[PDB]
Amino acid sequence: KGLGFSIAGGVGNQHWPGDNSIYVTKIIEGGAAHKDGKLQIGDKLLAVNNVALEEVTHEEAVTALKNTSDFVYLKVAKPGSGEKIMEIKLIK
Amino acid sequence: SKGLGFSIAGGVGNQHWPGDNSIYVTKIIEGGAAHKDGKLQIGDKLLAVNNVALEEVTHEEAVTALKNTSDFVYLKVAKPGSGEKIMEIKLIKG
């Protein structure tokens, strides 16, 4: 990053007991994610580009974030919403 | 994200055959843009999508290039056999 944010969670690395989801835990100031403004700390990462982030390890979630091009398509759910999915496009 | 009517495989870190990083067409949907145009074939090696070279890239990158396409798409493609090596194939999204 790159995109200026950090994540926690993953299978075998649960951020809440019993939940395998990836979560944003840190958003760098004046970084790509921040400058856009849509992404918030606590948001669940559903998918990066065409790679689903449900039931993957933390390492796979990082790999998925590296192997975008400069063009990034994030799918995200806000904590306690819907389920409603939201798309966030970002440039590295 | 897909209206060109085909799927790919291969890529750095996701080789279709050992040692081979190339992107290959592995599926073509009957009735789709690729099918109705008729030039693209299962087995074909995909070299570019518009401005994006696909020589030594991850599968995620190759997919992403095909994701960020508009109405008219330019594909560069390597055909085996006795013809010209590179074929360009332009397609309209359905």
Numbering used by the authors:
A (entry chain B): 13 to 104
B (entry chain A): 12 to 105
Question: How did the manuscript describe this experimental structure?
Answer:
To learn more about how circular permutation affects folding pathways, we analyzed a protein domain with a relatively complex folding pathway, namely the second Postsynaptic density protein-95/Discs large/Zonula Occludens-1 (PDZ) domain from synapse associated protein 97 (SAP97). SAP97 is a member of the membrane-associated guanylate kinase family, and involved in establishing cell polarity and synaptic potentiation. PDZ domains are usually part of such multi domain proteins and have important roles in molecular recognition. PDZ domains consist of six β-strands and two α- helices ordered in the following way: β1- β2- β3- α1- β4- β5- α2- β6.
A circularly permuted (cp) SAP97 PDZ2 domain was generated by fusing the N- and C termini of a pseudo wild-type (pwt) SAP97 PDZ2 with a glycine and serine linker (GSG) between E315 and P405. The new N- and C- termini, K327 and P326, respectively, were selected since they correspond to the terminals of the naturally occurring circular permutant of a PDZ domain from a green alga. The cpSAP97 PDZ2 protein crystallized in the space group C2 with two molecules in the asymmetric unit. The structure was solved by molecular replacement and refined to a resolution of 2.3 Å. The cpSAP97 PDZ2 protein structure has the typical PDZ domain fold with six β-strands (β1 to β6) and two α-helices (α1 and α2). The weak electron density and high B-factors for the Gly-Ser-Gly linker and the neighbouring residues in both molecules suggest that this loop is highly flexible. Interestingly, even after moving β1 from the N-terminus to the C-terminus, the orientations of the side-chains in the Ile317-Ile323 region of the cpSAP97 PDZ2 structure are similar to those in the pwtSAP97 PDZ2 structure. The data show that the circular permutation has decreased the stability of the protein from 4.7±0.03 to 2.4±0.09 kcal/mol. To sum up, our results show how a circular permutation neither alters the structure nor significantly affects the function of the protein, SAP97 PDZ2.
